[PDB]
Amino acid sequence: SMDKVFAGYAARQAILESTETTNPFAKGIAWVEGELVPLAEARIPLLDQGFMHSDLTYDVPSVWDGRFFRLDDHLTRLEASCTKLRLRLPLPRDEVKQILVEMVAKSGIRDAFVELIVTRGLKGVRGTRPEDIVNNLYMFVQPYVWVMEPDMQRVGGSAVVARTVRRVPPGAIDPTVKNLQWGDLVRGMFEAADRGATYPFLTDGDANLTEGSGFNIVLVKDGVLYTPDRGVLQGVTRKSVIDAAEAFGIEVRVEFVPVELAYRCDEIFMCTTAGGIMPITTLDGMPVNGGQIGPITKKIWDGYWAMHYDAAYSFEIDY
Amino acid sequence: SMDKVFAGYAARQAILESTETTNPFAKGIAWVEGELVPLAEARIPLLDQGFMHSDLTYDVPSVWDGRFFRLDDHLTRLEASCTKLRLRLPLPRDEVKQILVEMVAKSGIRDAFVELIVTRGLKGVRGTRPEDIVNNLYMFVQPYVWVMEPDMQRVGGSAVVARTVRRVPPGAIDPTVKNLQWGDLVRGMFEAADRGATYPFLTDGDANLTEGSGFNIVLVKDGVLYTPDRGVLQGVTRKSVIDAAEAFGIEVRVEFVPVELAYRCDEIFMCTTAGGIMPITTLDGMPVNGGQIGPITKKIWDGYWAMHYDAAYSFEIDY
Ligand SMILES: Cc1ncc(COP(=O)(O)O)c(C=O)c1O
Numbered sequence: 001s002m003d004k005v006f007a008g009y010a011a012r013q014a015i016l017e018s019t020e021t022t023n024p025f026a027k028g029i030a031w032v033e034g035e036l037v038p039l040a041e042a043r044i045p046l047l048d049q050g051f052m053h054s055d056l057t058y059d060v061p062s063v064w065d066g067r068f069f070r071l072d073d074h075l076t077r078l079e080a081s082c083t084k085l086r087l088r089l090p091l092p093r094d095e096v097k098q099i100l101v102e103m104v105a106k107s108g109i110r111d112a113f114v115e116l117i118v119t120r121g122l123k124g125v126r127g128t129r130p131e132d133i134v135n136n137l138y139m140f141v142q143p144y145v146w147v148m149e150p151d152m153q154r155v156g157g158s159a160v161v162a163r164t165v166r167r168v169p170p171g172a173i174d175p176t177v178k179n180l181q182w183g184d185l186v187r188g189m190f191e192a193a194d195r196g197a198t199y200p201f202l203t204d205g206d207a208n209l210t211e212g213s214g215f216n217i218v219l220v221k222d223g224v225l226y227t228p229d230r231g232v233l234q235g236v237t238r239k240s241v242i243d244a245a246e247a248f249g250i251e252v253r254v255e256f257v258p259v260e261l262a263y264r265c266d267e268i269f270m271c272t273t274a275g276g277i278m279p280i281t282t283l284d285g286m287p288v289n290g291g292q293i294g295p296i297t298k299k300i301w302d303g304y305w306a307m308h309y310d311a312a313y314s315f316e317i318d319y
Numbered sequence: 320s321m322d323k324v325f326a327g328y329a330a331r332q333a334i335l336e337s338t339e340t341t342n343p344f345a346k347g348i349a350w351v352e353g354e355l356v357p358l359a360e361a362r363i364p365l366l367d368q369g370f371m372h373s374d375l376t377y378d379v380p381s382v383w384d385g386r387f388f389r390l391d392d393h394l395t396r397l398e399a400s401c402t403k404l405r406l407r408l409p410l411p412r413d414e415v416k417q418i419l420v421e422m423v424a425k426s427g428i429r430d431a432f433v434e435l436i437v438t439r440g441l442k443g444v445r446g447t448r449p450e451d452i453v454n455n456l457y458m459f460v461q462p463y464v465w466v467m468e469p470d471m472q473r474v475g476g477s478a479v480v481a482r483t484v485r486r487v488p489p490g491a492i493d494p495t496v497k498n499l500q501w502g503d504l505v506r507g508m509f510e511a512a513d514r515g516a517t518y519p520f521l522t523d524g525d526a527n528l529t530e531g532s533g534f535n536i537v538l539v540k541d542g543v544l545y546t547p548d549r550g551v552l553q554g555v556t557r558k559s560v561i562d563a564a565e566a567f568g569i570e571v572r573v574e575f576v577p578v579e580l581a582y583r584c585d586e587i588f589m590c591t592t593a594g595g596i597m598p599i600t601t602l603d604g605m606p607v608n609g610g611q612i613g614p615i616t617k618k619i620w621d622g623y624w625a626m627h628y629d630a631a632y633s634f635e636i637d638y
């Protein structure tokens with residue numbers, strides 16, 4: 001049912017575009033210091049510690065066909081991330097939700113990438129008394145972003161297990177805290193391109209799989225799903241994959257996933273908010289179990305997008 | 320001869336402060352997109368990938384008593400860092416040097432912290448063709464920053480070996496590439512404060528010392544200097560420490576430094592551009608070999624500041 005999903009998106013894109021010459025927010029909208037402004041014009045202070053030392057957390061809910069998807073899960077993860085970094089969401093949570101909906105309405109964007117950022121503020125942890133630290137908030141709405149483009153999801157992507165880089169371990173930086181410190185992940189993207197592939201899979205350096213440059217990894221083997229427990233973000237897409245699998249009666253094991261399972265499994269897909277369910281059909285230059293998108297991947301694919309119209313996981317925005 | 324160095328600084332500081340209310344650049348000046356602006360007013364595009372994914376490198380030379388210290392070393396390290404990250408300094412190096420000198424002069428600042436930042440730009444590595452990527456440059460000059468303030472340097476600070484966090488390993492993020500991804504270092508600063516100390520010493524997760532939140536670590540035992548080789552920034556202050564130690568006939572060992580050596584060494588000091596030579600007299604709540612600043616620390620301290628008037632390591636700015 002990719003045709004239905006992608007055709008609906010192509011149609012809504014054409015409409016969105018024809019608003020660009022008259023709606024200054026049609027290419028994205030940003031919230032900065034309580035003002036709304038076109039995304040291409042948003043500026044932040046050079047001295048903000050979110051920039052000076054990437055001292056921040058963030059989270060990215062999405063809108064599809066005018067329905068916010070699992071927004072409360074994203075806001076709850078954001079607050080959990082903040083707590084773990086000794087940050088505090090600078091506005092009441094219900095007010096933040098209110099602003100996000102309004103921002104989407106003004107943009108007219110029906111399929112949107114939505115980002116919230118909480119930074120330490122203008123005074124850094126080093127030599128500022130904690131009582132004088134004032135956290136900052138930034139939010140923006142932009143057109144939906146594809147870690148895997150629709151036309152590649154019909155074909156499958158190519159991945160490698162990275163050998164020149166490995167994932168930052170939790171004892172250095174907690175990967176359950178969503179953060180913008182992408183040094184290892186960018187190295188991985190460089191390595192995949194050098195090796196003639198699109199996506200990097202990073203190990204934990206101890207012969208287990210973790211995650212990639214903006215996605216969780218799922219292996220399928222003998223009808224069972226396998227996905228890394230430790231060392232990764234606990235994605236909302238992954239959580240939706242788990243909800244779908246259980247509804248379908250497919251076993252899911254969130255556990256230590258040895259690198260070797262990647263070379264003898266039946267299917268592979270990545271999952272993430274900016275793109276959804278993303279099949280992988282070659283691994284280290286070899287077809288994954290024959291090279292075709294697998295049946296369980298397809299079932300999860302359809303179940304994920306179905307959830308976007310399910311009131312238990314979504315709500316409709318008034319534009 | 321701390322008295323002379325610090326009293327000279329205090330005097331120049333009183334002059335600078337007296338002008339804060341009439342020189343608009345006296346609190347700092349920034350270069351953004353070819354424009355010079357007061358530092359407190361400088362702003363960068365929200366969508367710059369230096370913010371969105373901390374996809375950048377940086378470097379921090381300094382000015383002392385109107386004399387740039389080792390600027391060409393810092394600029395060469397910046398270019399080497401750019402190369403490792405596949406970035407390119409956006410202006411010719413000699414034009415970059417000329418702008419900085421101009422910026423210091425306009426500010427009137429005689430003791431300056433000078434930062435250069437090269438970011439990926441407005442288009443990210445994920446989903447932009449490399450040929451369409453355009454790196455951005457930001458620079459600023461601000462009053463000299465003290466990781467350890469003069470009064471504390473006369474007496475020594477207190478550190479802990481961090482036990483809730485360890486340093487990001489090189490196979491994840493190269494610590495010789497100066498970067499603003501301080502997730503582990505901020506955790507270290509929190510841990511130190513939680514424990515009633517100031518400075519965190521992070522290990523490599525294999526029982527060896529690395530560096531801290533903005534500084535290298537040097538141990539002194541039986542007349543020999545020891546400082547970690549792998550897993551740390553190759554500090555320009557550390558390079559100056561080595562030049563001074565060789566000048567004095569003191570042996571320096573840049574090698575693997577087991578954590579245990581910190582508990583039985585004779586002296587400890589930190590070194591960094593933002594403060595210079597910073598003695599440590601208590602470790603994990605215990606005195607370091609008596610709790611007094613050691614004689615080899617004092618010799619390195621004096622020689623470090625003497626090098627700031629040596630034409631081989633510095634040049635005078637025309638204000
Ligand atoms: C490193 C990383 N892992 C996993 C994910 C997937 O998380 P989620 O499904 O909540 O978007 C992302 C999100 O972009 C990510 O950046």
Ligand SMILES: Cc1ncc(COP(=O)(O)O)c(C=O)c1O
Pocket residue numbers: 379530531532533534535551552553554555556557590591592593
């Ligand atoms: C992590 C880290 N280690 C060491 C240093 C010391 O480098 P340098 O002496 O060149 O300033 C710095 C400087 O702030 C640093 O951030």
